A paper describes a structure:
Ornithine decarboxylase (ODC) is a pyridoxal phosphate (PLP)-dependent enzyme that catalyzes the conversion of ornithine to putrescine, a rate-limiting first step for the tightly regulated biosynthesis of polyamines (putrescine, spermidine, spermine).1−3 At the molecular level, positively charged polyamines interact with negatively charged RNA, DNA, and phospholipids, thereby directly contributing to chromatin biology. The ODC enzyme is a homodimer, with the dimer interface forming its catalytic site from residues from both monomers. We report two X-ray structures of ODC complexed with new ODC inhibitors, computational docking, molecular dynamics, and binding free energy calculations to validate the experimental models. The X-ray structures reveal that covalent adducts with pyridoxal phosphate (PLP) are formed in the active site of the human ODC enzyme, as verified by their preparation and enzymatic testing.
We then turned our attention to the inclusion of the 5-membered pyrrolidine analogs. Compounds 10, 10-R and 10-S had ODC IC50 values of 0.36, 0.21, and 0.10 μM, respectively. Like that observed for the piperidine derivatives (7-R and -S), the IC50s values are only slightly differentiated favoring the S-enantiomer and in a range similar to that observed for APA. As before, it is anticipated that the PLP adducts are formed in the active site and are the true inhibitors. To help verify, we have also prepared 10-R-PLP and 10-S-PLP and found that they both demonstrate inhibition of ODC enzymatic activity, with IC50 values of 0.16 and 0.03 μM, respectively. The activity still favors, as observed for 10-R and -S, the S-enantiomer with 8-fold relative activity. In each case, as we saw with APA, the adducts 10-R-PLP (2.9 Å resolution) and 10-S-PLP (2.0 Å resolution) were formed, forming trans-oximes with PLP. The lipophilic cyclic pyrrolidines of 10-R-PLP and -S-PLP, form strong lipophilic interactions with Tyr389 and weaker lipophilic interactions with Phe397, the pyrrolidine rings orientated in an orthogonal manner relative to each other. The basic pyrrolidine amine of each makes a H-bonding interaction with Asp331.
Numbering used by the authors:
A (entry chain B): 6 to 298, 310 to 422
B (entry chain A): 1 to 298, 310 to 422
The structure:
């Protein structure tokens, strides 16, 4: 089974070269299903980079971003924590041998039976942001260590009047007092700035707000020690606001509001940072139409779409950039083109308009940075199966993973 | 009510005097004093049989080929196969599903106009001869991978009033249709008919008339080039519930005179359709549990309810199918009871996983149930397990008389 099958990446070869090779091998096979190449070594590189940029912050990987068992196994060997949102994710993490103290149940609104599942399996730390959640915890997991999730302002959000998660400071005070009444232990504070962060100062504000709630806890008699700064960090360099800019703004704020001598323990919940760039998707052009506007335009149909990997266009506000597998000659002509998914849906369209050389059925298109919120949310609408994932890892990357295990 | 063994093929008896609603009530009452309150469906296969009887009555000249993609539940396909419908399959997996249930290939149309070559090869290997197409490259692929196929030319329609527009993506113009027929003649490929799709969620029935007229024209084009055209495929778009402005019978009352005018029976034409949501929409009712609750003060009281199904699950139809969902209470509320402005949210971490932005509901509590009717079409077929949340259990029910009706259809 390919789930736990990993291939060697030879010296001097990158995931890109492996992609080229696999494509050339099937040139006349006629079996040209879409497929992923996933470089686990890129995940190890991301971990080293995190250790360098955020030395005070323990990463808890957000399983929901991509729950591939190979990914979770690699990260567990690396020694990260895991942020789990449901019973199934907890089951996945524990099946790989991760002890419960490396799991945070960071879902603020949890079904009671799933809270009980967490309690049965020793997962003690959970987040919350409402009084009803406190009632549920008191009845189903009374010895849990609760982390109060506070609200953060996203000025760019589509729905700004109705925020799904996060308590205001005013509500946070009442929640701390209520938890004290119910004899429930609150041990920290969490927040989530969001993937669509444009200004790193948002983090500063969140950290400042977190400190405020910490002070409230001290007033009510809690011994607060856990600060969870959430996720939202970029997973590729193809972004305006790069990881290191964010961390360069975060670390002084952490030192100012949560100095190390205070005894605070700082964690994060990065999802896309670890996995986005590790996965590259190859889709095959399965159909083609030429529309005359005599300026020629083209419609290409590929065998992955908005019901599959490209659901990220709708759910994750993703902007995907098609890349050519075979290097184009410098002089060849480009045409206005659209790219469509395989399903019956007229809205199953990947790219409305782009410039491409004339391509043919059987040619491949590549999409980089497809690791995050792509396969995790794919469906089998129309009966189309999920692309196979080929995991690769070089020898030196495996050695680095061994060093992390030691 | 509890499934034992396989969910797919387990069916429960629906006793005399009971409706699917009563089964929902019973299931809810049965788990009233426990903490396992996962979301679940009640699927009344008898409603599907009723829909088939209604179709036979309203469109006696049109053989239905069920659009498997709308809801690919094995129980649904088995019931319809026993009923004797055809099947419209969009991929190798759907063909596999239909054939596994024992349906012969002549009751399958591969009505995907833009097919991967290996899937065309699969269709050829398993005797599925009839496929649609709307482009020259498709003719090349068929000539190379399925040369003996019977092709149905899919034409464009003005579906501007339809809820789900398909014509931007699929369908040849009449001008293109002439060239496609001539090209098919060059390649020695047999074109046997014409198909169209007015668009899912049709709002104006006159579209069908024009579509049928266009089909007649293409038929005539085929006759000019030497094809003997006999198959007319009028697609889908029919409503699946009575909760719509444009009801099934108005559409069929517009379709039947057009069929008689442009395709009289004495011509030898064979007329089929590809209804998806018509057969299954109202057969499924979804019950979700309120798993979390927040009170927001405006003191005008407002409420946020969190349930254990969402936009990544069954309610993906809000995004993909332009669905407008109406939450229903298990017990019809007393007239005097106070209502509050309320929002309904899915279980996932996503801030946009929101089912209902604003509605009026009495104050509800964790453990209460909400019902969503007419959830059969384009709901489970496109659900994912994002965040690790599992698909709702489906409980299939069927009364004795419904089974008798199915037996009559099978004979
Ligand atoms: C509570 C919590 N923790 C971590 C993450 C992961 O965020 P990343 O940006 O680092 O991956 C999340 C993510 N929550 O929502 C992001 C969704 C919204 C659309 N697709 C991604 C989280 O909620
Ligand atoms: C070719 C073809 N045949 C039948 C159907 C079924 O249409 P119904 O309206 O009868 O269910 C279709 C539908 N195709 O896309 C409609 C999807 C898109 C979003 N949700 C519905 C079809 O294409």
């Amino acid at each position: 089974n390919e789930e736990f099958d990993c291939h060697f990446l030879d010296e001097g070869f990158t995931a890109k070269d492996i992609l080229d090779q696999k494509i050339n091998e099937v040139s006349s096979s006629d079996d040209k299903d879409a497929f992923y190449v996933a470089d686990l070594g890129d995940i190890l590189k991301k971990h080293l980079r995190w250790l360098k940029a955020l030395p005070r912050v323990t990463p808890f990987y957000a399983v929901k971003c991509n729950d591939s068992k190979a990914i979770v196994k690699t990260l567990a060997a690396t020694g990260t924590g895991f942020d789990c949102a449901s019973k199934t994710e907890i089951q996945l993490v524990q099946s790989l041998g991760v002890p419960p103290e490396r799991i945070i149940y960071a879902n603020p609104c949890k079904q009671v039976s799933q809270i009980k599942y967490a309690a049965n399996n020793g997962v003690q730390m959970m987040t919350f942001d409402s009084e009803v959640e406190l009632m549920k915890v008191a009845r189903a997991h009374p010895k849990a260590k609760l982390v109060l999730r506070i609200a953060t302002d996203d000025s760019k959000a589509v729905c700004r009047l109705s925020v799904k998660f996060g308590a205001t400071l005013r509500t946070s005070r009442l929640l701390l007092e209520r938890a004290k009444e119910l004899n429930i232990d609150v041990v920290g504070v969490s927040f989530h700035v969001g993937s669509g962060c444009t200004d790193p100062e948002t983090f500063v504000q969140a950290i400042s707000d977190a400190r405020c709630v910490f002070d409230m806890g001290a007033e009510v008699g809690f011994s607060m020690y856990l600060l969870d700064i959430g996720g939202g960090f970029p997973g590729s360099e193809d972004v305006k606001l790069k990881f290191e800019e964010i961390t360069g703004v975060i670390n002084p704020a952490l030192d100012k509001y949560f100095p190390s001598d205070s005894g605070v323990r700082i964690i994060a919940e990065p999802g896309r940072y670890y996995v986005a760039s590790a996965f590259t998707l190859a889709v095959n052009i399965i159909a083609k139409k030429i529309v005359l506007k005599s300026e020629q335009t083209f419609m290409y149909y590929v065998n992955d779409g908005v019901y599959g990997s490209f659901n990220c266009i709708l759910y994750d506000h993703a902007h995907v950039k098609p890349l050519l597998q075979k290097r184009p000659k410098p002089d060849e002509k480009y045409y206005s083109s659209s790219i469509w998914g395989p399903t019956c849906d007229g809205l199953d369209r990947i790219v409305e308009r782009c410039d491409l050389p004339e391509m043919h059925v059987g040619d491949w298109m590549l999409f980089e940075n497809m690791g995050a919120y792509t396969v995790a949310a794919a469906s089998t609408f129309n009966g189309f199966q999920r692309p196979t994932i080929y995991y690769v890892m070089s020898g030196p990357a495996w050695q680095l993973m061994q060093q992390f295990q030691n």
